[PDB]
Amino acid sequence: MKAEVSQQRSLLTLSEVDAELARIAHRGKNLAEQKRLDELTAQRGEVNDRLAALGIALEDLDAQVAKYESEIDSVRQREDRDRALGAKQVTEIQHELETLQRRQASLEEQLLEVMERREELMAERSEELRRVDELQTELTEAQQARDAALVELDQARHQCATRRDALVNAIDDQLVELYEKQRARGGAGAGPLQGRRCGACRIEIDRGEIARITAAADDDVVRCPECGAILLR
Ligand SMILES: [Zn+2]
């Protein structure tokens, strides 16, 4: 097989454009901005998990102060209902009121302990809300930089796509087809002959085949014996 040397040089640039598009696709899946957004999202979920755990403890303490204040109201109402006054049975109410006054005091002790504990946890929850709010703000900053990097990679991809479309139209389709058949093997399809090493698979070509490669004409097309990529000189 043979092909004009002018289009063989176009095939070399064509293999260069394909390599650049490969790095663009690789960069789109390995962005540094995406890694930054992954970190901020992780620790934002950390505070969201701690905020949810604090909400459970606050619900439990809210249920305690609701049960405490309700039982004191029953003792307070019983003290006020019995406050409205038989003198023989009056002493019977005096001994009960003293025992109920001891119950209202003992209940107020437990109520102040859980009110302090609720006041401490509401401050901790307030400290985590400030923390997750600051994390969320720069999370959107990382999200705008992640999206801004994707539109730059896509813009550079479209420009290399237009350059690739122009090169294929300038080469005989019989040569472009062989380049695609070699890429279907996983190789680079076309690479330069750098000294004695292939520019694609990076092998060291033996002295035997290389003696025949240097003897081929300019219009001739040659491939690497190990990978098959079209060697260009
Ligand atoms: Zn090769």
Side-chain angles (χ1 to χ4, degrees), residues 190-195 198-203 205-206 208-209:
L193 178 62
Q194 30 191 242
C198 171
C201 57
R202 286 293 176 176
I203 64 145
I205 298 180
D206 66 328
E209 302 261 5

Side-chain angles (χ1 to χ4, degrees), residues 109-126:
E109 210 169 68
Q110 320 170 22
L111 174 60
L112 297 193
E113 180 170 333
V114 296
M115 279 189 173
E116 292 175 359
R117 185 52 176 173
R118 180 170 71 173
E119 193 87 352
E120 296 176 15
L121 291 188
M122 290 186 300
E124 179 179 357
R125 145 171 281 267
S126 182

